Chains A and B, each alone.
Chain A
């Protein structure tokens, strides 16, 4: 519930030498619409010669997942900055929505590469339709046939306020 995917459409301000300017559309992941629009101008400034003071926003809409109850495999392309230089990566995730996949990606990059939110560009998010499109071995073991496994050494849940138990707890639940 931290992120949502938005559609943002923007335009250069019309002038007499060019009425009816072109329209550009981007897909932005953001926690709210105030930072969705700020993110839009950031990316457009890097591609076209437009600013916020010489343009305007046309439309903002929320894109919802079409089947948020079906398990899917996702692939993501991204570009990030390390302490010296920039690099490209491709990672994979398994969940039920595009928003869930992006949230897991941001946590994963912070843990394994110490990359902050401010140094990551998302290039493309694609749902992998065929089971033959899975590349990473940590996903392949999850799409194996006839999967099943037990849960050994499970610690029982005990109220914090209850100190001084009178029996030795078990771990076979």
Chain B
């Protein structure tokens, strides 16, 4: 019975902040989206919502899981990387962790 999964988002990875060679700006992050490899493909995802979910120690209001919400703003480079802004900047220990790219604001 129903040997299928339940996935409605696209996978992504947190790479780093916006930076120069020796200066870094945490207010913006760079995200790699799986499967997109050029600027034209990345134009589809402008404006979507991004979620970063993780675990904590204690329960607050019925759970031990927390979220930080954000959105995609503009492309980056020539190879499909994009920029994003979150409500709070990401913790920077998560360089290499995974995020969820929604489809909420559609067409």
Contacts and interface: CB of A to CB of B under 8 A. Distances in A.
Q: Report if A and B touch in the complex (beta carbons < 8 A).
A: yes
Nearest to B37: A161
Interface secondary structure of A, over-half rule: loop
B28 to A, nearest CB: 23
B79 interface: yes
Contacts, number: 4
Interface string B67-94: 0000000000001100000000000000
Interface residues of A, number: 2
Interface string A134-173: 0000000000000000000000000101000000000000
Contact residues on B (Cβ < 8 Å of other chain), bracket: under 10
A60 B107 CA distance: 53
A161 B81 CA distance: 12
B37 to A, nearest CB: 4
A159 B80 CA distance: 14
Contacts of A161: 37, 79-80
B38 to A, nearest CB: 8
Nearest to B79: A161
A99 B98 CA distance: 55
Contacts of B80: 161
A154 to B, nearest CB: 24
Interface string B50-71: 0000000000000000000000
4 contacts: A159-B37, A161-B37, A161-B79, A161-B80
Interface of A: 159, 161
Across the A-B interface, give the 4 residue pairs with the lowest CB-CB distance, nearest first: A161-B37, A161-B79, A159-B37, A161-B80
